[PDB]
């Protein structure tokens, strides 16, 4: 009898035990895509950045052509406009 | 640690939640109920059953595949459902991967019973490789890291209350409420039914609009009184002598019709409160079936299967307050009122996961972990032995 | 690791797959590689089979190893996705004698996984990889999660999925996909050509076809200030319409914002599912048509959107007239709005994004292959200690 | 150009099956399917890009 009730005890010890590990081993689905969003968004900033600064030195090129002789796209459809009332 | 995988499968009294193993989440969760329609054809599926709503054949018929005591009813239906999970959410063939379900405490009588019609589903219809049935309080309070525990299972179809000692379900102190989840339902449709437009096919009606606008308006409309809300507005009543809120009002559309519900907070204690004083439902009801004194009977009745001082600081420290309807803001606290009540002499240790998520599948978790021990061993796995074994003479 | 121009990424779709080798290092672009998604299967003596690219003698069998988005024939299935790695190996080796001294050396393979397949089917899918394509760096993506980080990353969203027999709903939470509630509708693109079919029954339906496609073809809510308009058929035809070019979109609306109801009713932390509601993301070929998106978000606007309902607010108003504070409700949503999209991608913002999820595929894409560790894809390693199981590892 | 040949030179590891299994402790009287490191036609063809191009 007493002995019963101690394999019962240590029984349900072990599977407590078993699943107090997991608890801290697992790491499941949402760790997953959760660690995947906050990587991403880095990866944005720094793509993000680098894309900021492409941009940045394609005006930066065509500004010193225009000094040698979307904004890119307004001033054409501006001085284009203004061309227009001219050409009108 | 081990080379395997399983199909876990909760058949609750309204949910029937089902997934691998492998994942955090269930696969799926359908209705615990189906629709039948004529030759033969059953309906399960969440948004099937809906679809087959929004057809409104005639013929078309409900029905539930779990019983009052949270034991399947209709076994030829139940096979079908499971057919249903293996071909179009699991999608694999029963006869690869193991299976792993479970059941609520009860109180043994008819655990043969069961044992044998599952033998013959599991078994002799569709060849699963090896069966393996566990008790969902039991696996609750394990996933909780608890030896002992109380508990409270504020769910739908009844109130299960299951005192666990030492890793023992005490079966003699198991108790069922009659009251839950359902019977609140019932109240709420028919508390509102005066803002309503009026006020079998018609039953297929009922459970489409359960498992809609009312279970929307039971999300965030109830909501539970601190204290007793007799006592507590008499208080109020006296403080206004010497604010009180329960004249605060509280808004909700009624979706289907277009139109605003409005009630005071008063009203949305006085649903809570069913679950408190059952006889103020009605004089079929005695005071001790409230969730206060069948707890406190429940304990009582621990104590006496096995040292009651000892028992009692066990149980009440050990307090696992759990089920879809325990979501209810202010539940928790009132629960933990009423114990008080009822035990001022002891400290009171309640635990309560507020991940709603956790909570509604807590059962189904509770056999994912108990599913995902490395120790095989430790299930008392069934096999085709175990059918024969039972059909042998 | 890892050369951008070594990296792989793969999408299908029940009608063609977007193969895309290699990266633009710079920024991202619009995949350049279009296939078919079918496969000629030959029955030979007692049945045993071949497959091939083209149907040899007039004898093999068209097959398609994608329907509605899910895998019906996974033998046929990597046997296309085979055909296509060998495919690019074979240009790319070519076009470049090195080929093996440096691009087609440590090739990183990104396959997006449509929703719909098994457990099992992904086991088989990634036992291939390793063990017939041999590709030692594997990410199977849901696509789901990959739209997700295109819309500059969201916890609380959902997306639309349209195809073209099917369309899929999806809810985001935390960043989890909530498996248990996505589901799926049995319409897409082509149920709009069948109601166009049905509404014009005289025209042919490559006519048809071609309109849905053309820019005439329109939801409303400037040829939308014309009576008529015109387009030129597949053959040079001038076709001329009426109001019908605004016509046959509904229903699909319709069906898919009744599924978008019912799932995100049941999100359990309501505190999540409003910020849900904030964050709509619509993806697929059929939502480049202009007008769509916003026809679909003011369908679910009307049928979702918790607010006084119409004279009760005014009745507010009217007992005023004789200052109202707003009528709070439990409910949700109380706003329910579109995702912003990138300002970043010049490419992807001059091809316009239904293709966008792809996108969200590339951006996740460097952001995991220039990176220190492996902790989000399988090795061979890896493959080597679970098995297929190891999908479930680093399972998204 | 063959394929398959084309696979040994690129990307330059033991296999698996999915067949059945008996648990053990001591062996119990069941079996199950799944990958277990195993014991130790095709597309024929190859498709023609440039067709399959957006140009
Ligand atoms: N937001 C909510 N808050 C509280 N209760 C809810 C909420 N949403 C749904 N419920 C109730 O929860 C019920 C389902 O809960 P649950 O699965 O715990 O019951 P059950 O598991 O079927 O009962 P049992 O545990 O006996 O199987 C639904 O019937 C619904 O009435």
Same mark, same amino acid.
């Given at each position: 009898?007493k002995?019963?009730?101690?394999?019962?005890?240590?029984? #349900?010890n072990? #599977?407590?035990?078993?699943i107090?590990?997991?608890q801290?081993?697992?790491?499941?689905?949402?760790?997953?895509?959760?660690?995947?969003?906050?990587?991403?968004?880095?990866?944005?900033?720094?793509?993000?950045?680098?894309?900021?600064?492409? #941009?940045?030195?394609?005006a930066?090129?065509?500004?010193a052509?225009?000094?040698?002789?979307?904004?890119?796209?307004t001033?054409?459809?501006?001085?284009?406009?203004?061309?227009?009332?001219?050409?009108? | 640690?081990?080379?395997?995988?399983?199909?876990?499968?909760? =058949?609750?009294?309204?949910?029937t939640?089902?997934?691998?193993? =492998?994942?955090?989440?269930?696969?799926?969760?359908?209705?615990?109920?189906?629709?039948?329609?004529?030759?033969?054809?059953?309906?399960?599926?969440?948004?099937?059953?809906?679809?087959?709503?929004?057809?409104?054949? =005639?013929?078309?018929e409900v029905?539930?595949?779990?019983?009052?005591?949270?034991?399947?009813?209709n076994?030829?239906?139940?096979?079908?459902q499971?057919?249903?999970?293996?071909?179009?959410?699991?999608?694999?063939?029963?006869?690869?991967?193991?299976?792993?379900?479970?059941?609520?405490?009860?109180?043994?009588?008819?655990?043969?019973?069961?044992?044998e019609?599952?033998?013959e589903?599991?078994?002799?219809?569709?060849?699963?490789?090896?069966?393996?049935?566990?008790?969902?309080?039991?696996?609750?309070?394990?996933?909780?890291?608890?030896?002992?525990?109380?508990?409270?299972?504020i769910?739908?179809?009844?109130?299960?209350?299951?005192?666990?000692?030492?890793?023992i379900?005490?079966?003699?102190?198991?108790?069922?409420?009659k009251?839950?989840?359902?019977?609140?339902?019932?109240?709420?449709?028919?508390?509102?039914?005066?803002?309503?437009?009026?006020?079998?096919?018609?039953?297929?009606?009922?459970?489409?609009?359960?498992?809609?606008?009312?279970?929307?308006?039971?999300?965030?409309?109830?909501?539970?009184?601190?204290?007793?809300?007799?006592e507590?507005?008499?208080?109020?009543?006296?403080?206004?002598?010497?604010?009180n809120?329960?004249?605060?009002?509280?808004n909700?559309?009624?979706?289907?019709? =277009?139109?605003?519900?409005?009630?005071?907070?008063?009203?949305?204690?006085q649903?809570?409160?069913?679950?408190?004083?059952?006889?103020?439902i009605?004089?079929k009801?005695?005071?001790?079936?409230?969730?206060?004194?069948?707890?406190?009977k429940?304990?009582?009745?621990?104590?006496?299967?096995?040292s009651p001082?000892?028992?009692?600081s066990?149980?009440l420290?050990?307090?696992?307050?759990?089920?879809?309807?325990?979501?209810?803001?202010?539940?928790?606290?009132?629960?933990?009122?009423?114990?008080?009540?009822?035990?001022?002499?002891?400290?009171?240790?309640?635990?309560?996961?507020q991940?709603?998520?956790?909570?509604?599948?807590?059962?189904?978790?509770?056999?994912?972990?108990?599913?995902?021990?490395?120790?095989?061993?430790?299930?008392?796995?069934?096999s085709?032995?175990?059918?024969?074994?039972?059909?042998?003479? | 690791?890892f050369?951008?121009?070594?990296?792989?990424?793969?999408?299908?779709?029940s009608?063609?797959?977007?193969?895309?080798?290699?990266?633009?290092?710079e920024?991202?672009?619009?995949?350049?590689?279009?296939?078919?998604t079918?496969?000629?299967?030959?029955?030979?003596?007692?049945?045993?089979?071949? $497959?091939?690219?083209?149907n040899?003698?007039?004898?093999?069998?068209?097959?398609?190893?994608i329907?509605?988005?899910?895998?019906?024939?996974?033998?046929?299935?990597?046997?296309?996705?085979?055909?296509?790695?060998?495919?690019?190996?074979?240009?790319?080796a070519?076009?470049?004698?090195?080929?093996?001294?440096?691009?087609?050396?440590?090739?990183?393979?990104?396959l997006?996984?449509?929703?719909?397949?098994?457990?099992?089917?992904?086991?088989?899918?990634?036992?291939?990889?390793?063990?017939?394509?041999?590709?030692?760096?594997?990410?199977?993506?849901?696509?789901s999660?990959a739209?997700?980080?295109?819309?500059?990353?969201?916890?609380?969203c959902?997306?639309?999925?349209?195809?073209?027999?099917?369309?899929?709903?999806?809810?985001?939470?935390?960043?989890?996909?909530?498996?248990?509630?996505?589901?799926?509708?049995?319409?897409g693109?082509?149920?709009?050509?069948?109601?166009?079919?049905?509404?014009?029954?005289?025209?042919?339906?490559?006519?048809?076809?071609?309109?849905?496609?053309?820019?005439?073809?329109?939801?409303?809510?400037?040829?939308?200030?014309?009576?008529?308009?015109?387009?030129?058929?597949e053959?040079?035809?001038?076709?001329?319409?009426?109001?019908?070019?605004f016509?046959?979109?509904?229903?699909?609306?319709?069906?898919?914002?009744?599924?978008?109801?019912?799932?995100?009713?049941?999100?359990?932390?309501?505190?999540?599912?409003?910020?849900?509601?904030?964050?709509?993301?619509?993806?697929?070929?059929?939502?480049?048509?202009?007008?769509?998106?916003?026809?679909?978000?003011?369908?679910?606007?009307?049928?979702?959107?918790?607010?006084?309902?119409?004279?009760?607010?005014?009745?507010?108003?009217?007992?005023?007239?004789?200052?109202?504070?707003?009528?709070?409700?439990?409910?949700?949503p109380?706003?329910?709005?579109?995702?912003? $999209?990138?300002?970043?991608?010049?490419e992807?913002?001059?091809?316009?994004?239904?293709?966008?999820?792809?996108?969200?595929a590339?951006?996740?894409?460097?952001?995991?292959?220039?990176?220190?560790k492996d902790?989000?894809?399988?090795?061979?390693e890896?493959?080597?200690?679970?098995?297929?199981?190891?999908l479930?590892?680093?399972?998204? | 150009?063959?394929?398959?040949?084309?696979?040994?030179?690129?990307?330059?590891?033991?296999?698996?099956?999915?067949?059945?299994?008996?648990?053990?402790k001591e062996?119990?009287?069941?079996?199950?399917?799944?990958?277990?490191?195993?014991?130790?036609?095709?597309?024929?063809?190859?498709?023609?890009?440039?067709?399959?191009?957006?140009?």
């Amino acid at each position: 009898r007493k002995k019963e009730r101690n394999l019962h005890l240590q029984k #349900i010890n072990s #599977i407590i035990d078993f699943i107090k590990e997991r608890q801290s081993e697992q790491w499941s689905r949402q760790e997953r895509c959760f660690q995947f969003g906050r990587l991403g968004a880095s990866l944005h900033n720094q793509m993000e950045k680098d894309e900021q600064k492409r #941009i940045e030195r394609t005006a930066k090129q065509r500004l010193a052509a225009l000094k040698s002789n979307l904004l890119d796209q307004t001033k054409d459809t501006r001085i284009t406009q203004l061309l227009r009332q001219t050409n009108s | 640690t081990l080379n395997r995988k399983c199909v876990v499968i909760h =058949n609750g009294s309204h949910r029937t939640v089902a997934g691998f193993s =492998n994942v955090e989440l269930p696969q799926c969760i359908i209705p615990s109920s189906y629709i039948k329609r004529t030759e033969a054809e059953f309906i399960f599926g969440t948004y099937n059953m809906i679809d087959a709503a929004a057809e409104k054949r =005639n013929g078309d018929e409900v029905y539930t595949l779990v019983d009052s005591q949270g034991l399947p009813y209709n076994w030829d239906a139940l096979e079908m459902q499971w057919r249903y999970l293996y071909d179009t959410q699991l999608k694999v063939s029963p006869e690869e991967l193991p299976l792993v379900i479970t059941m609520p405490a009860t109180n043994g009588k008819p655990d043969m019973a069961i044992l044998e019609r599952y033998y013959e589903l599991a078994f002799d219809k569709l060849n699963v490789p090896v069966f393996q049935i566990v008790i969902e309080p039991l696996a609750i309070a394990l996933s909780m890291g608890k030896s002992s525990a109380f508990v409270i299972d504020i769910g739908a179809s009844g109130c299960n209350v299951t005192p666990i000692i030492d890793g023992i379900v005490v079966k003699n102190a198991v108790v069922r409420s009659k009251f839950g989840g359902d019977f609140l339902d019932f109240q709420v449709h028919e508390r509102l039914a005066p803002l309503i437009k009026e006020e079998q096919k018609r039953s297929t009606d009922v459970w489409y609009e359960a498992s809609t606008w009312i279970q929307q308006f039971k999300s965030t409309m109830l909501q539970v009184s601190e204290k007793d809300l007799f006592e507590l507005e008499r208080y109020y009543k006296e403080q206004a002598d010497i604010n009180n809120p329960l004249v605060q009002k509280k808004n909700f559309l009624f979706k289907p019709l =277009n139109k605003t519900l409005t009630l005071d907070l008063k009203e949305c204690y006085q649903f809570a409160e069913y679950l408190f004083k059952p006889q103020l439902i009605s004089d079929k009801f005695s005071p001790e079936d409230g969730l206060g004194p069948l707890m406190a009977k429940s304990v009582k009745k621990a104590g006496a299967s096995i040292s009651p001082e000892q028992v009692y600081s066990l149980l009440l420290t050990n307090v696992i307050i759990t089920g879809s309807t325990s979501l209810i803001e202010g539940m928790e606290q009132r629960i933990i009122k009423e114990l008080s009540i009822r035990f001022p002499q002891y400290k009171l240790t309640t635990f309560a996961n507020q991940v709603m998520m956790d909570r509604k599948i807590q059962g189904w978790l509770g056999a994912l972990t108990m599913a995902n021990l490395p120790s095989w061993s430790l299930g008392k796995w069934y096999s085709k032995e175990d059918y024969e074994t039972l059909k042998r003479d | 690791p890892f050369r951008q121009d070594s990296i792989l990424i793969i999408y299908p779709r029940s009608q063609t797959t977007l193969v895309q080798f290699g990266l633009n290092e710079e920024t991202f672009t619009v995949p350049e590689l279009e296939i078919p998604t079918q496969i000629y299967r030959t029955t030979r003596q007692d049945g045993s089979y071949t $497959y091939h690219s083209t149907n040899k003698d007039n004898k093999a069998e068209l097959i398609k190893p994608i329907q509605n988005g899910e895998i019906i024939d996974i033998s046929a299935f990597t046997q296309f996705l085979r055909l296509i790695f060998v495919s690019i190996l074979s240009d790319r080796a070519n076009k470049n004698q090195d080929a093996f001294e440096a691009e087609l050396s440590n090739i990183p393979l990104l396959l997006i996984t449509h929703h719909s397949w098994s457990q099992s089917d992904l086991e088989i899918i990634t036992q291939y990889v390793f063990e017939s394509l041999e590709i030692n760096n594997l990410i199977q993506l849901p696509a789901s999660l990959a739209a997700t980080y295109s819309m500059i990353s969201l916890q609380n969203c959902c997306i639309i999925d349209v195809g073209t027999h099917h369309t899929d709903i999806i809810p985001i939470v935390d960043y989890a996909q909530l498996d248990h509630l996505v589901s799926s509708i049995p319409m897409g693109g082509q149920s709009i050509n069948d109601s166009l079919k049905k509404l014009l029954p005289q025209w042919d339906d490559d006519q048809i076809e071609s309109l849905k496609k053309s820019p005439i073809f329109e939801v409303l809510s400037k040829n939308s200030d014309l009576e008529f308009n015109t387009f030129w058929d597949e053959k040079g035809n001038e076709i001329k319409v009426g109001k019908q070019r605004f016509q046959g979109c509904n229903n699909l609306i319709k069906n898919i914002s009744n599924r978008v109801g019912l799932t995100l009713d049941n999100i359990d932390d309501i505190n999540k599912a409003k910020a849900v509601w904030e964050n709509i993301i619509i993806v697929g070929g059929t939502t480049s048509i202009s007008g769509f998106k916003e026809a679909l978000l003011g369908q679910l606007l009307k049928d979702h959107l918790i607010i006084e309902p119409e004279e009760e607010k005014s009745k507010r108003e009217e007992e005023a007239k004789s200052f109202v504070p707003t009528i709070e409700y439990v409910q949700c949503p109380t706003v329910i709005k579109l995702a912003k $999209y990138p300002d970043y991608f010049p490419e992807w913002k001059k091809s316009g994004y239904s293709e966008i999820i792809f996108l969200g595929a590339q951006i996740v894409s460097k952001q995991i292959f220039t990176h220190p560790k492996d902790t989000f894809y399988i090795t061979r390693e890896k493959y080597n200690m679970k098995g297929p199981a190891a999908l479930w590892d680093v399972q998204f | 150009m063959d394929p398959q040949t084309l696979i040994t030179k690129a990307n330059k590891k033991e296999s698996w099956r999915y067949d059945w299994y008996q648990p053990s402790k001591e062996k119990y009287p069941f079996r199950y399917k799944t990958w277990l490191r195993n014991q130790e036609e095709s597309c024929e063809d190859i498709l023609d890009l440039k067709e399959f191009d957006r140009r």
